[PDB]
């Protein structure tokens, strides 16, 4: 697919790249953020031009936020390869994402306000949404679900077909100027029959109950409710140590934070653990939403 | 593309230009209810006369409509169009539009305009500027030989020029759609020249008026320095003389704005005066071609 180098700090860096490769891009070159970031294209003059004369690569991106000036003298320079800075590049992701008018139209109106001050410088089917935050792995899931990017993909189980629908991750210190956008594309997930909450279980003990905590929160704020929640703690594999002292905090505290929680169970998409255990809970789930209204 | 009008008696002239200036093929055409219905402004009779016609494709309600009449009106209208001035104006202005800033403002205002509905749920150019129903439309297409790029170069005896139809003069612009109007209509400003474009068929009172507006809308813009020629248009209305018109309006454009080019007498549609027009055409580029 389209490649893309990436410039971005040590610490963003894993974000970084998981959101980029969620705008289908294909990570070819990985550059941290300039010390003192120049003045004429944000970055050295000789390394936009090596970018520039590198048929491997399609699209510059910025893990920062560019000012009008940078974005017009790099675009002058690439001649055709698309240029993206943070905001542009989660506005293009919530893009993938959007469904609905509302969210489309948002996140297009941020967008034009924010090229405006650049351009003035020159049978039945049940559906199943997969939420968590970009570090909980939700996207390998959905890859491992699916068997693969389309965010939204039916897969049959038995005599079932769901369709498991890949909404926008939760993410943390957004933008002020695209809160709006996020926020509407994010509400989506409120049209689903059930989800799927996708937990990084490689946190600490505090952290991980403040990530469960935080994203039944968002859940609620979007405004989600009396919908069926199958949490899935995720990055079991890499856990290296005590996995039930962690579940069982899971388990224990998902109850006392929301309902209905369907249920909880550990996977790790990467090692396709328990994975087979998991279609057959979603098969279950499927079961029971149809028989949810039938009389 | 059909549409059906609804608009009061007195808009009812700029409206039907508006309409079709936008690409629609006025169809029907009814009165504006004075006694607006609260769901969908227009009574809910017609309403369902308008869906049960598969002659119309667009239904154009000449006013501004709050989001919950859009709302009623898109759910009973299933498969048709519908459009009100506000959403008329700014598809107007993406016709005229020329620079992508222009684009993106008009863009810009559609959506403001659109999401609070849905929550609730060198070739010398000249640009041919004016009052909607001065005729400008019909003048650029008289002499294009269109019968809509609205901007097209025609060669006058052995020159190529760029006519420019601009965004018409709007009367009571609504404030959603400011921004957006004037971007699309500073475009004037790159052309070389001007052609204003002003009603014959108007008194005294309101064509010293309409100059007056129509020079002061070209200062709110920043023209300045550029030659415009003023064509006195639907003379084929007037009975009398179009003399003391022509000089009134020559006296006072002189006295309001600078240089002013010459001032003639024409018609649109009857074609009158259209070859002076296109030689006067002539004499102003071949003085830009040096100056």
Redesign the interface.
Known sequence: MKTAALFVSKEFEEEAIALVEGANYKVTSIYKLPKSPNVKFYIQYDKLQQIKNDEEISTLIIFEQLKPRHFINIRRELKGKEVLDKILLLLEIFALHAGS??AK??I??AR??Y??PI??ETNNIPSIGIVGYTNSGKTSLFNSLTGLSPKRYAIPINNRKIMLVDTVSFIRGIPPQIVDAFFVTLSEAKYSDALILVIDSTFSENLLIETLQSSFEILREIGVSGKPILVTLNKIDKINGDLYKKLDLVEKLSKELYSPIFDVIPISALKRTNLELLRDKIYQLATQLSLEHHH
């Open positions: 008018k509302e139209m948002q297009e109106l034009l306000k090229e405006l351009i003035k």
